Amino acid sequence: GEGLYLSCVDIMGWRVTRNYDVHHWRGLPRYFKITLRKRWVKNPYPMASLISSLFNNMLPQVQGQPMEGENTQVEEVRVYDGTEPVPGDPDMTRYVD
Amino acid sequence: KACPRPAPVPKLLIKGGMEVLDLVTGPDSVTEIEAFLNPRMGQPPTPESLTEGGQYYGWSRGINLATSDTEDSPGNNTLPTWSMAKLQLPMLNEDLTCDTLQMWEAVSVKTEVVGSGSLLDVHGFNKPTDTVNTKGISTPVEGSQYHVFAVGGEPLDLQGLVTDARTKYKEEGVVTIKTITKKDMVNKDQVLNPISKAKLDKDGMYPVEIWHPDPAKNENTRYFGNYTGGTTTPPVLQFTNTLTTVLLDENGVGPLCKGEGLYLSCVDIMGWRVTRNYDVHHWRGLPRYFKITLRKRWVKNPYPMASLISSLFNNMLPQVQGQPMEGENTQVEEVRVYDGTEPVPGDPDMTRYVDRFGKTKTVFPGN
Amino acid sequence: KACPRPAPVPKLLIKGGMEVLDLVTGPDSVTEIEAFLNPRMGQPPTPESLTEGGQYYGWSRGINLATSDTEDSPGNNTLPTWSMAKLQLPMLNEDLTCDTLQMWEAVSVKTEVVGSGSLLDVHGFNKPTDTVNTKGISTPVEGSQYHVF
Amino acid sequence: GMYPVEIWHPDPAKNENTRYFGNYTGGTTTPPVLQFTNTLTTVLLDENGVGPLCKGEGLYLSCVDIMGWRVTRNYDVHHWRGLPRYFKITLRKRWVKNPYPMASLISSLF
Amino acid sequence: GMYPVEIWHPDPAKNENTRYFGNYTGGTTTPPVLQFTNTLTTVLLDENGVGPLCKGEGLYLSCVDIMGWRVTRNYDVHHWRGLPRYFKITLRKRWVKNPYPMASLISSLFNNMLPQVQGQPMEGENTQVEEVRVYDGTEPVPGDPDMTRYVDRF
Numbered sequence: 001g002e003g004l005y006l007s008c009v010d011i012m013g014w015r016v017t018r019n020y021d022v023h024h025w026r027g028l029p030r031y032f033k034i035t036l037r038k039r040w041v042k043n044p045y046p047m048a049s050l051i052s053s054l055f056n057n058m059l060p061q062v063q064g065q066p067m068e069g070e071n072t073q074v075e076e077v078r079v080y081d082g083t084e085p086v087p088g089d090p091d092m093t094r095y096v097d
Numbered sequence: 098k099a100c101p102r103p104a105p106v107p108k109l110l111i112k113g114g115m116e117v118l119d120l121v122t123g124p125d126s127v128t129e130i131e132a133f134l135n136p137r138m139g140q141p142p143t144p145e146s147l148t149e150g151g152q153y154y155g156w157s158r159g160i161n162l163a164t165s166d167t168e169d170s171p172g173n174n175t176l177p178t179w180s181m182a183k184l185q186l187p188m189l190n191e192d193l194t195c196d197t198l199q200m201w202e203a204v205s206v207k208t209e210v211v212g213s214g215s216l217l218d219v220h221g222f223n224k225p226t227d228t229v230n231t232k233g234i235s236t237p238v239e240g241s242q243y244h245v246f247a248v249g250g251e252p253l254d255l256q257g258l259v260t261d262a263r264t265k266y267k268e269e270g271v272v273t274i275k276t277i278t279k280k281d282m283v284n285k286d287q288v289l290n291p292i293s294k295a296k297l298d299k300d301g302m303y304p305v306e307i308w309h310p311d312p313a314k315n316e317n318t319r320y321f322g323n324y325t326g327g328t329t330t331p332p333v334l335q336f337t338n339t340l341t342t343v344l345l346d347e348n349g350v351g352p353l354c355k356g357e358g359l360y361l362s363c364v365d366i367m368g369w370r371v372t373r374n375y376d377v378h379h380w381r382g383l384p385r386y387f388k389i390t391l392r393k394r395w396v397k398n399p400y401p402m403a404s405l406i407s408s409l410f411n412n413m414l415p416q417v418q419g420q421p422m423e424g425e426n427t428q429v430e431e432v433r434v435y436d437g438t439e440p441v442p443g444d445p446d447m448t449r450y451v452d453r454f455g456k457t458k459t460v461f462p463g464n
Numbered sequence: 465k466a467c468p469r470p471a472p473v474p475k476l477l478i479k480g481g482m483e484v485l486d487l488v489t490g491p492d493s494v495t496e497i498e499a500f501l502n503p504r505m506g507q508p509p510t511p512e513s514l515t516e517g518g519q520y521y522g523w524s525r526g527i528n529l530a531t532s533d534t535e536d537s538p539g540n541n542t543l544p545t546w547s548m549a550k551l552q553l554p555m556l557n558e559d560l561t562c563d564t565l566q567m568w569e570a571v572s573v574k575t576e577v578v579g580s581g582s583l584l585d586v587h588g589f590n591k592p593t594d595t596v597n598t599k600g601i602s603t604p605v606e607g608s609q610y611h612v613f
Numbered sequence: 614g615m616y617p618v619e620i621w622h623p624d625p626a627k628n629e630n631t632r633y634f635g636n637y638t639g640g641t642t643t644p645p646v647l648q649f650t651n652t653l654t655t656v657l658l659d660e661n662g663v664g665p666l667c668k669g670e671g672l673y674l675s676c677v678d679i680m681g682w683r684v685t686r687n688y689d690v691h692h693w694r695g696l697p698r699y700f701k702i703t704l705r706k707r708w709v710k711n712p713y714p715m716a717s718l719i720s721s722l723f
Numbered sequence: 724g725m726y727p728v729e730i731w732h733p734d735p736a737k738n739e740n741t742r743y744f745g746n747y748t749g750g751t752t753t754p755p756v757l758q759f760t761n762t763l764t765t766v767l768l769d770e771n772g773v774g775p776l777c778k779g780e781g782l783y784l785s786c787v788d789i790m791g792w793r794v795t796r797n798y799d800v801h802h803w804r805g806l807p808r809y810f811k812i813t814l815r816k817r818w819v820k821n822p823y824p825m826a827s828l829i830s831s832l833f834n835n836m837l838p839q840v841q842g843q844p845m846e847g848e849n850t851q852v853e854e855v856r857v858y859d860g861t862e863p864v865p866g867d868p869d870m871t872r873y874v875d876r877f
C-alpha cells in the first residue's frame with residue numbers, strides 16, 4: 001500500500017467500584033516511534049495484469065461448475081518442464097498407510 | 098557406470114491439483130489438466146436423498162408435455178441444459194518493454210464420456226420388453242442423443258433457435274431467448290434469430306433445446322458434437338483413453354485463455370429412460386472427462402499501454418457535467434491545424450482536408 | 465536483452481460488415497465473409513403473428529395430400545423449396561488499359577447447419593409416443609431428410 | 614424460395630463455376646443426424662486451383678436443409694422441418710485476361 | 724469376473740499405463756456385428772513412444788464382450804451372451820531409470836527402531852499443518868511475495 005500498521009492493547013487490570021464488585025477495568029495508551037527507510041524491491045506485480053483485468057471486464061461473470069473449491073471436478077494436474085530419462089514407476093514416493 | 102541411458106521422456110515437475118500450477122513453471126513447461134463436467138440436464142444434485150429427489154440425479158425429471166398447440170410449457174427439469182465450467186489459471190509474465198505478453202494456450206485435449214456401461218442395467222422398472230405378461234427386460238435407454246462440447250479461452254458464444262417460439266419457458270430459473278432479450282420470441286428466433294445470441298455465462302442454465310454453439314464469424318473455442326434424432330434410436334458410444342485432439346487453430350494456435358481461465362462446455366444426452374407408470378419418457382445423460390494440454394505462448398499485446406494507463410487517469414478526473422463541445426449541437430464552430438509554412442495562398446478562405454489516405458488543396462468550393 | 469517474437473499470423477485489416485470490402489483491399493488481400501441462409505421451405509417469413517401464420521416459419525405448412533393417381537395437388541406451402549442468395553462484392557478492376565482484369569475468386573468455406581438441438585423438444589404437440597393414452601413424448605422430427613448446397 | 618427441391622436439381626452441366634453437394638436420406642421414420650462443427654473448412658478450389666470466380670462480382674450461396682416431418686398430435690399432418698446454414702466464404706483476388714479485346718462482330722453474335 | 728460391467732468403467736485417471744478401448748451399442752433389437760480378422764495389429768505405444776511397461780513383472784489383459792441377449796422361447800427371459808477374446812502381445816525389453824529405493828527397503832526397518840504412531844493429524848482434511856514453504860535459490864527481494872497469482876484475488 002504505502003501503509004504502516006500500528007496495532008496494540010494495554011490492559012492494566014480491573015478498577016473496582018467501592019459500590020459493589022463492578023470490577024470494570026482500565027487500560028493505558030501507547031506511543032510509537034518508527035524509524036523507516038526506503039528500500040528497493042523487485043516489483044511483485046505484472047502491470048498488464050490490468051490488460052488481464054480488461055479481459056476480465058469485457059469477459060462476463062460465470063456462474064458455472066466447480067474447477068476450484070472442495071468439490072472441484074479437476075481430477076489432476078501435472079507440469080513438465082524438462083526431459084528425464086524414462087522413469088521406472090513414475091509415481092513411487094513416501095509410503096505411509 | 099555407463100549402464101545404458103533410458104529413453105528421454107519429458108520430465109514431470111510435479112503433479113497434484115490446481116495448486117501445482119501455482120509453482121513457477123518456466124516457459125515451455127506444460128500443464129496437463131484432467132477434469133470433467135457432470136451432465137446437468139434437469140434434476141439438480143441437491144436433493145441428495147434418493148427419495149426426495151428420487152435421485153433422478155442426471156436424469157430429466159419427467160416429461161412435461163403440452164396442453165395443445167396453443168399451450169406448451171415444459172418444466173424446469175423437463176429441460177436438459179448446457180453443462181460447463183471455467184478453470185482458473187495462474188497469470189504469466191509481461192514485457193511492457195517489447196509490449197508482449199504470454200498467455201495460457203490450449204493445444205489438444207482428450208475427452209471421453211463415461212458410463213456407457215451403465216446402460217446395460219436391464220432390470221429395474223422401465224417399461225418391460227413384453228408389456229403384456231409384463232415381462233422381459235426393463236427397457237434400456239433409447240431415443241435421440243446429443244453430445245457436443247467445446248474448449249475455449251473465453252466462454253462459448255451461442256445462438257438460439259427453437260422449434261416453437263410460443264413455448265412457455267419460465268422466466269424463472271433458466272435462460273431463454275427472452276431472459277436474454279427481454280422481449281418475447283418471434284418466428285425468427287424459431288429459425289435463425291441473429292439477435293438471439295448469448296454467451297455461456299451461466300451453467301446448467303441455457304437448455305440445449307434452445308442455445309446452440311453459434312458459428313459466430315469469430316471464436317476462441319473449439320467445439321463440436323452431433324444430433325441423432327429419433328424415438329427408439331440406439332445409443333452409441335466410445336470408450337477410449339487413446340485419442341487426443343487439436344484445439345490448435347489454422348495458424349497453429351488453439352485457444353488462449355484471456356482472463357487466465359480455460360472454459361469447458363458440453364452436453365451428453367443418451368436418450369429417454371421409460372417408466373412403466375406411464376410413458377414418462379424422461380431422459381439420461383453421462384459425464385465427460387477432459388484432458389487439456391496447454392502451453393505458454395508469447396503474444397503481441399493487443400491494446401496499447403497508454404490507452405489503458407492513461408484511459409484510466411482520464412476516467413479519474415471530475416466528471417463534467419457541462420455545455421456540448423461534441424455531438425449533434427457542438428458549440429464548436431470550427432477547427433483548423435497547421436504545422437507547415439507554405440507561401441501565401443490565393444483564396445484565404447481556402448480549405449484543406451485529407452482523406453482515406455492523402456491531403457488536398459480542397460476543391461475550389463466552386464463545384 | 466531482446467524481445468520474444470510471437471508467431472506470425474495474417475494481420476487483420478478491418479472487420480465488421482459488408483462496408484469493409486470497400487477498403488482498397490490491395491491484391492493479396494483476403495476476405496472472409498460469414499453469412500447464413502434461412503430455410504425457406506413451406507411457410508414464408510411475413511405472417512409474423514404466431515397465430516395468423518401460426519408460425520410455421522421454417523416448416524412445410526400442412527401436407528396437401530393428393531386425391532388419386534389421377535389427382536395430385538401440391539399446395540404451395542406444402543412445398544419445401546431452394547433457398548439461395550447473392551453477396552454483392554465490390555468491383556476490382558479499374559485500369560482498363562490492360563489486357564489483365566482482376567476478379568473475386570472463392571477458395572473455401574466452412575459451413576454448418578444449426579440447431580439440431582431444437583429437435584430435442586419432445587413435449588409440445590405432436591403425435592405422442594403412446595397414442596393410446598395419449599402419453600409419452602410428442603414425437604420428434606423423423607423422416608426423409610435432405611441437405612445440399 | 615421458389616424452385617422447389619421436389620422438382621429442381623443441381624444439374625451437372627458440361628461446365629460449372631459452382632461447387633455443390635449434399636445428400637438424400639429417404640425414409641418414413643428415418644432418424645435425423647447432424648454435424649455440429651466449428652473446426653472444418655472446405656475447399657471450393659477446383660481441379661486447377663481455381664474455385665469459383667464471381668463473374669459479375671456476385672457470390673452465390675444456395676442450399677436446402679430438410680430434416681423430416683413433424684407430425685401433428687391430431688391427424689397425420691406430416692408437415693416437415695428445416696434448419697438454417699452458416700457460411701464462411703474465404704476468397705481472394707485472381708488475375709485474368711481482358712475478354713473485350715475480341716472485336717465488334719468477331720464475338721458479338723458468335 | 725467380479726466387477727460387473729454394469730457398474731465399473733475404465734476410468735481415465737489423470738494417470739494410466741494401460742490402453743483400453745471399447746464401445747457401447749445400445750438397443751433392444753439391435754443387430755450384432757463383428758470383425759473376424761487376423762490382419763491388423765494395434766499399438767499400445769504411448770505418446771512418447773512407450774507403451775506399457777509391466778510394472779511388477781506383469782502384463783495385464785482385461786476385456787468384455789457382450790453380444791446381446793438370447794431370449795428364451797418360454798417367456799421373456801433374456802439372458803445374454805458374450806464371446807472370448809484372444810490377444811497377441813508383442814513386448815520388448817526397455818531401459819528405464821531405477822524406481823525401487825533400497826533405502827525404503829532397509830528403512831522399512833527404520834520405523835521398527837520406533838513403533839507406530841497414533842497422534843494428531845498432519846496429513847488429511849484436518850492436518851494441523853497450517854503451512855509449508857520450500858526455498859532453494861535466491862532472488863532479490865520482491866514486494867508482496869505472496870502475490871495473488873490468480874487474477875480474481877484482486
Ligand SMILES: CC(=O)N[C@H]1[C@H]([C@H](O)[C@H](O)CO)O[C@@](O[C@H]2[C@@H](O)[C@@H](CO)O[C@@H](O[C@H]3[C@H](O)[C@@H](O)[C@H](O)O[C@@H]3CO)[C@@H]2O)(C(=O)O)C[C@@H]1O
Pocket residue numbers: 151153157158159160161172173174175372374377379
Ligand atoms: C417413482 C415415480 O413414479 N416417479 C415419477 C415422478 C413422480 O410421479 C413424482 O413426480 C416424484 O415422486 O414423476 C416424474 O415426472 C414428474 C415431472 O415431470 C415433474 C415436472 O415438474 O412433474 C411431475 O408431475 C407434476 C405435475 O406435472 C405438476 O403439474 C404438479 O405440480 O406436480 C406433479 C408432481 O408432484 C411428473 O410426474 C418425476 O421424475 O418427478 C417421473 C417419475 O417417473
Ligand SMILES: CC(=O)N[C@H]1[C@H]([C@H](O)[C@H](O)CO)O[C@@](O[C@H]2[C@@H](O)[C@@H](CO)O[C@@H](O[C@H]3[C@H](O)[C@@H](O)[C@H](O)O[C@@H]3CO)[C@@H]2O)(C(=O)O)C[C@@H]1O
Pocket residue numbers: 166518520524525526527528539540541542685687690692
Ligand atoms: C394446429 C394444426 O393442426 N394446424 C394445422 C393447420 C390448421 O388447420 C390451420 O392453420 C387452420 O387455420 O392446417 C394445416 O394444414 C393446412 C395445409 O395443408 C394447407 C395447404 O395449402 O391447406 C389447409 O387447408 C386449406 C385448403 O386446402 C385451401 O384450399 C383453403 O383455401 O384454405 C384451407 C385452410 O384455411 C390445411 O388445413 C396448415 O398448415 O395450415 C396443418 C397444420 O398442422
